[PDB]
Amino acid sequence: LDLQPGQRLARGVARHLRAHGFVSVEEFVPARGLRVDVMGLGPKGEIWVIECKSSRADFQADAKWQGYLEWCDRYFWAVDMEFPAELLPAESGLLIADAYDAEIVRMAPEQKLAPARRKVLIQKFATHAARRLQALRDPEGHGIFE
């Protein structure tokens, strides 16, 4: 695997979400100026944001993480077993992950999204997923201006 450390965690997170009836995308943009490492979508439309921190420095750089809260029902960190997990915010959910799997060790508290916002984000997720899929199946089949 030539995946970067964050991509590795996200692979394991995605495997684990899928094993439990969720689906996911990577590098999702809920609003201008924000990007989340993994967005998970539950079978009833539950929205999870998972930030994959591959190092303490990676975590130090996500200082405005509380800004992700308004864009999800549940917010989680995902780190590997070498990460000092006790330093993460107590109120957050937590997964321990690697490139091959993940486990939730602390379930995030539920801060449900309003109906209109849930709609916008599901539409964005759909769009993200379907674009990336089409591009993998048909690499030449789009233009530079979209």
Q: Which residues of the shown chain bind a copy of itself in the complex (CB under 8 A)?
A: 11, 14-15, 18-19, 21, 23-25, 41, 43, 45, 119, 122-123, 125-127, 129-134, 136-138, 141-143, 146
Residue 112: left if φ>0, alpha if ψ -120 to 50, beta else—which one? beta
Q: Which does 84 bind (CB under 5 to 8 A by kind): Na ion, a copy of itself, none?
A: none
Nearer to a copy of itself, 106 or 128 (CB): 128
Other C-beta atoms lying within 10 Å of the C-beta of residue 68: 19
User: CB under 5 to 8 A by kind: which of Na ion, a copy of itself, none does 58 bind?
Assistant: Na ion
Residue 69 binds which of Na ion, a copy of itself, none (CB < 5-8 A, kind-dependent):
none
Tokens of 78: 């995902």
The backbone region for 69, taken as left when phi is positive above 0, alpha when psi lies in -120 to 50, beta otherwise, is alpha
**Range list of H helices, the chain:** 5-19, 56-61, 115-137
Quick one: which of 6, 12, 40, 93 contacts Na ion (CB under 5 A)?
Answer: 6
Q: List 36's β-bridge partners, or say none.
A: 28
Q: State which residue, 26 or 73, has the beta carbon closest to Na ion.
A: 26
**Is 25 among the residues that bind Na ion (CB under 5 A)?**
yes
- Could you tell me if 38 and 50 are in contact, meaning their C-beta atoms sit under 8 angstroms apart? yes
Which residues contact Na ion (rule: CB under 5 A)? 6, 25-26, 52, 58, 132
